[PDB]
Amino acid sequence: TLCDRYGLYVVDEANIETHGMVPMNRLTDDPRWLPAMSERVTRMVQRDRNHPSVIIWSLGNESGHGANHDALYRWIKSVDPSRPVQYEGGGADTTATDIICPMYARVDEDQPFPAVPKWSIKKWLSLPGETRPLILCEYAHAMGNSLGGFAKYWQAFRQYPRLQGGFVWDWVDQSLIKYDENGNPWSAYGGDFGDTPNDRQFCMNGLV
Amino acid sequence: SDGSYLEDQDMWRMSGIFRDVSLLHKPTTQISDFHVATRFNDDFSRAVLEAEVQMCGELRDYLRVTVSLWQGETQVASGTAPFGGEIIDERGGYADRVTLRLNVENPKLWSAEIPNLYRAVVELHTADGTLIEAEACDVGFREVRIENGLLLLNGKPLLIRGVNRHEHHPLHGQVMDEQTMVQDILLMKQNNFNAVRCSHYPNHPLWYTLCDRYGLYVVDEANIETHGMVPMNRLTDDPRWLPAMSERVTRMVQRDRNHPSVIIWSLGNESGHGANHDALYRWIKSVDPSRPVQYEGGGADTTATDIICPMYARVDEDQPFPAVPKWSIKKWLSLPGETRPLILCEYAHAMGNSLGGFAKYWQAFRQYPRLQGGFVWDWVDQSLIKYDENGNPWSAYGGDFGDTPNDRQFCMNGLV
Ligand SMILES: OC[C@H]1O[C@@H](SCCc2ccccc2)[C@H](O)[C@@H](O)[C@H]1O
Ligand SMILES: OC[C@H]1O[C@@H](SCCc2ccccc2)[C@H](O)[C@@H](O)[C@H]1O
Ligand SMILES: [Mg+2]
């Protein structure tokens, strides 16, 4: 409602992420989990499809590429043809996305990982056969003293028509407040609650 | 002559009988044309050589054509037939043509790395075995196609290490001899070049034979350039010049279509974009579907080219001219709708102390699949020799012969 009234474009995303599985698509390639995944996608679309600010649907995040993703991509295109669908898993340019949507691809430097390479964004555009627009779903990881080389993304976005921008990672630090002996507040991060294992200060990636 | 309007190439303007003169004797019944084409299975393990032969003179029932294929001294394949093609339309077929098909198993493929050649002999003879006349040419088995935005040879993507070359000699002007041609080919291969662009007209016929034998890819180019017109397409958009332009394109293709080294046809150079170029692009695709056609005029990516072929586009910097912008080559590839390969028909102008930033092109060629290389401008300086008072020779350039107006030292752009 607030994004409709003030004016922001929204990507609305299904609650599906299976990052810690080995391999990452162990559940999203299994037909026994197709029921559980379909409730997460179909109920989001039935709730939010009347909002003008929602311009793109997303199938979730970091769950590899499985046949369950293709089935659900096609379900949304059929019930709601008025918005594109994006999905980054399985190398950011599978048959389950309308937009190439890499995370942390660099402007000029290739990172050739096996099965899921991250090409430079200028090169990705022109691979044999490729016609889709490119919008980075995560770029410029703002952890601590960061955003070096930000100008280099914005030079490329303005020069190439099919580079249509991206979403910085991310808005606000996820720190929590703890109290010392004198009752003075302090900012705490992973591991400060006796939680173990933990990922320490990786929870603070915000611009604010 | 009015033909001078179509020959405004950047070079010395000279005149005369500057190539060979010869007499040829043929019998009255004679081979008047022949074409050779090669087709492959998916992995290049089986080929069909198809030969079309046409005759002139009086057709008789006893006339026969034999085509044989030789590898060294070993005969590899042979075929024989009487005249009479298959039915073409409601009125019949060509009584004065025949098509032989020869199967070849595990052919050795031609490329610039390994220039394997066969020899095809065509014999017109009587049914009882008397020879009337024989003709022959060198055959290279290779396939050139564009697939999914890449130029492929024998199924693999090419990287063109090319140069532009003019026919120029400092003492003899535009007269080419064999010794000069061989010297240029050895120096090119010794400096890691694999391709040559005939800038900007068909070459002496011996050039294509040497490129077949030593191994260079050739772009063969029609003698059409109207650079000094305003606007540049004033003649190539006029239908009254369509006759003159079509003779320059159709006669080049009828002369050179049997050479394995010729892999790409070009419609000429710097003549804007006119409806005459579209008509002639389509003529070549129809008579010779086995080679791509390229043309740079009118902004390097018109409907008259299979390859985007800019001249002097930069690696990273755009040059946005009105109507005919030169995009950076990395950006050109990804413009909305664009799917073709990109090969620069001229880059890295080598005038005087030059080629700064050459490494930057080669970094981009190796990183982007659809950037498949380019032709440097150019091979040899076009200087001429003059003599001083003591008879000592010196190298001269535009304006040193009292020629005016002239373009001074712009005639020297060579790597040698
Ligand atoms: O803010 C951390 C980022 O971590 C990387 S995993 C690679 C880095 C990593 C892996 C394991 C523990 C800590 C960091 C994700 O791809 C991003 O979406 C984001 O969550
Ligand atoms: O070697 C000179 C080059 O000149 C430029 S025109 C622009 C430069 C120019 C124009 C008029 C006179 C002198 C140079 C051509 O496009 C090239 O193909 C090549 O011929
Ligand atoms: Mg010119």
Topology:
This is part of a larger assembly, with 2 copies of chain A.
Chain A: H1 2-6, E1 10-13, H2 34-48, E2 54-58, H3 67-79, E3 85-86, H4 121-124, E4 134-139, H5 150-159, E5 163-168, E6 176-179, E7 185-188
Parallel strand pairs in A: 1-2, 2-3, 4-5
Antiparallel strand pairs in A: 6-7
Bound molecules: 2-phenylethyl 1-thio-beta-D-galactopyranoside (PTQ) (2 copies) and magnesium ion.
Descriptive overview:
- It is classed as sugar binding protein.
- The structure is cut from a larger assembly and holds two copies of chain A.
- Chain A has one domain.
- Chain A is 23% helix and 15% strand.
- Chain A is built from five helices and seven strands.
- Chain A has helices at 2-6, 34-48, 67-79, 121-124, 150-159, and strands at residues 10-13, 54-58, 85-86, 134-139, 163-168, 176-179, 185-188.
- In chain A, strand 6 (176-179) and strand 7 form a beta hairpin.
- The longest helix of chain A has 15 residues, at 34-48.
- Chain A starts with a helix and ends in a 20-residue tail after the last strand.
- Chain A binds chain B through residues 110, 120, 122-123, 125-129, 131, 159-162, and chain B through 148-150, 318, 328, 330-331, 333-336, 339, 367-370.
- The site of one 2-phenylethyl 1-thio-beta-D-galactopyranoside has 6 residues of chain B, from loops.
